[PDB]
Amino acid sequence: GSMIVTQTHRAISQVVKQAKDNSVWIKILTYSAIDVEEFQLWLKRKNLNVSLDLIKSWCDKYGVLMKGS
Amino acid sequence: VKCNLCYECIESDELRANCPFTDCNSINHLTCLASSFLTEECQVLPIEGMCTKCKRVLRWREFLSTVFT
Ligand SMILES: [Zn+2]
Ligand SMILES: [Zn+2]
């Protein structure tokens, strides 16, 4: 684990949980797979720029299923 | 139907958590219940939590009896 990497991972969680659009959180809470590329764009629209690597590692660490994986 | 944590109405088209024990049947928004179960700000998916009505400690999945069917 890295303290600084987890700060960016925390920002992704905060967007998921704080966005008016709760559809991503509802997918996670119902064990429905997320399209990582679509998610990256969704995050970008919420003022959050993150890489696909950051998203994949976030999903792996916090229990989010990825389409194709 | 009223969410038992935020007191807003739960629409007919909306997914909702319920305690799987009929003797309790605590009903609430998925996001509301999940938020009440989370222990740290980076987390998005509850593992387990205590039903606030009956006090049983159950895994997240147990609250999803109506979500998939
Ligand atoms: Zn609620
Ligand atoms: Zn209960």
Numbering used by the authors:
A (entry chain B): 349 to 417
B (entry chain A): 178 to 246
Mind quoting what the paper says about this structure?
Slx1 harbors an N-terminal catalytic GIY-YIG endonuclease domain followed by a C-terminal zinc finger motif. Individual Slx1 has very weak nuclease activity, while association with Slx4 could dramatically enhance its enzymatic activity. Slx1 C-terminal zinc finger and Slx4 C-terminal helix-turn-helix domain are well conserved throughout evolution, and have been mapped out to be the minimal fragment of each protein required for the complex formation. Here, we report the crystal structure of the Schizosaccharomyces pombe Slx1 C-terminal RING finger domain in complex with Slx4 C-terminal four-helix bundle domain, which provides structural insights into the Slx1-Slx4 complex formation.
To provide structural insights into the protein component and complex architectures, we determined the crystal structure of Slx1RING-Slx4CCD complex to 2.0 Å resolution. Slx1RING possesses a RING finger structural topology, which includes the pattern of chelating two zinc atoms and has a characteristic helix α1. Homology search with Dali server indicated that Slx1 zinc finger shares the most similar fold with a consistent series of RING finger proteins (e.g. FANCL, RNF4, and RING1b), while Slx1 RING finger contains an unusual long loop following helix α1 which is directly involved in the interaction with Slx4CCD. Slx4CCD is folded as a helix-turn-helix domain containing a four-helix bundle (α1–α4), with residues from helices α1, α2, and α4 constituting the Slx1RING binding interface. Slx1RING-Slx4CCD heterodimer buries a total accessible surface area of ~1470 Å2. Both hydrophobic interactions and hydrogen bonding contribute to the complex formation. The long loop (Thr216-Ile224) with negative electrostatic potential protrudes and binds to Slx4CCD helix α1 area with strong positive electrostatic potential, which contributes to the formation of complex interface. Slx1 C-terminal domain was originally classified into a PHD finger based on the primary sequence information, but the structural information we provided here indicated it possesses structural characteristics of C4HC3-type RING fingers.
